[PDB]
Protein backbone atom coordinates (compact mmCIF):
# COMPACT_ATOMS: atom_id res chain seq x y z
CA UNK A 1 0.00 0.00 0.00
CA UNK A 2 0.94 3.69 0.90
CA UNK A 3 1.81 6.22 3.68
CA UNK A 4 -0.78 9.30 3.74
CA UNK A 5 0.50 12.17 6.09
CA UNK A 6 -2.44 13.87 7.88
CA UNK A 7 -2.40 17.02 9.68
CA UNK A 8 -3.29 16.26 13.37
CA UNK A 9 -6.03 18.75 13.73
CA UNK A 10 -7.75 17.17 10.42
CA UNK A 11 -7.29 13.41 11.27
CA UNK A 12 -11.08 13.65 13.08
CA UNK A 13 -12.46 14.30 9.75
CA UNK A 14 -10.70 11.99 8.02
CA UNK A 15 -11.86 9.25 10.44
CA UNK A 16 -15.29 10.52 11.00
CA UNK A 17 -17.85 9.88 14.24
CA UNK A 18 -17.00 6.06 15.47
CA UNK A 19 -14.73 5.60 12.35
CA UNK A 20 -17.74 6.33 9.83
CA UNK A 21 -15.25 8.20 7.21
CA UNK A 22 -11.95 5.82 7.23
CA UNK A 23 -15.60 3.24 6.88
CA UNK A 24 -17.01 4.88 3.61
CA UNK A 25 -13.57 5.71 2.06
CA UNK A 26 -12.61 1.70 2.77
CA UNK A 27 -15.95 0.52 1.47
CA UNK A 28 -15.71 2.83 -1.67
CA UNK A 29 -12.24 3.01 -2.55
CA UNK A 30 -12.04 -1.08 -1.43
CA UNK A 31 -8.77 -0.77 0.92
CA UNK A 32 -7.84 -1.04 4.45
CA UNK A 33 -6.46 2.17 6.14
CA UNK A 34 -4.53 2.04 9.95
CA UNK A 35 -3.40 5.37 11.28
CA UNK A 36 0.51 4.32 12.04
CA UNK A 37 1.43 4.66 16.26
CA UNK A 38 2.90 7.45 17.15
CA UNK A 39 4.14 9.53 20.01
CA UNK A 40 1.04 11.96 19.81
CA UNK A 41 3.78 15.05 19.38
CA UNK A 42 4.01 15.01 15.74
CA UNK A 43 2.58 17.76 13.57
CA UNK A 44 1.44 14.84 10.91
CA UNK A 45 -0.55 11.42 11.36
CA UNK A 46 0.16 9.07 8.47
CA UNK A 47 -2.83 7.11 7.23
CA UNK A 48 -1.08 3.14 5.67
CA UNK A 49 -3.44 2.50 3.19
CA UNK A 50 -3.06 -1.55 1.83
CA UNK A 51 -4.60 -2.65 -1.52
CA UNK A 52 -3.79 -3.04 -4.76
CA UNK A 53 -2.30 0.69 -6.39
CA UNK A 54 -4.89 2.02 -7.87
CA UNK A 55 -7.02 1.53 -5.26
CA UNK A 56 -4.73 3.17 -2.60
CA UNK A 57 -4.72 6.08 -5.12
CA UNK A 58 -8.20 6.70 -5.21
CA UNK A 59 -8.14 6.59 -1.62
CA UNK A 60 -5.27 8.84 -0.93
CA UNK A 61 -7.37 10.79 -3.32
CA UNK A 62 -10.52 11.42 -1.98
CA UNK A 63 -8.51 11.85 1.44
CA UNK A 64 -6.64 14.69 -0.30
CA UNK A 65 -9.83 16.01 -1.53
CA UNK A 66 -11.37 15.86 2.18
CA UNK A 67 -8.40 18.00 3.65
CA UNK A 68 -8.37 20.09 0.62
CA UNK A 69 -12.26 20.95 1.22
CA UNK A 70 -11.39 22.23 4.45
CA UNK A 71 -7.90 23.88 3.50
CA UNK A 72 -5.27 20.98 5.47
ZN1 LIG B 1 -10.16 14.64 -6.49
Not at 1 to 30: L, Y
Not at 44 to 71: F, K, M, N, Y
Amino acid sequence: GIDVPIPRFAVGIVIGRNGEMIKKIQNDAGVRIQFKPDDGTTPERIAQITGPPDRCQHAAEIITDLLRSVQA
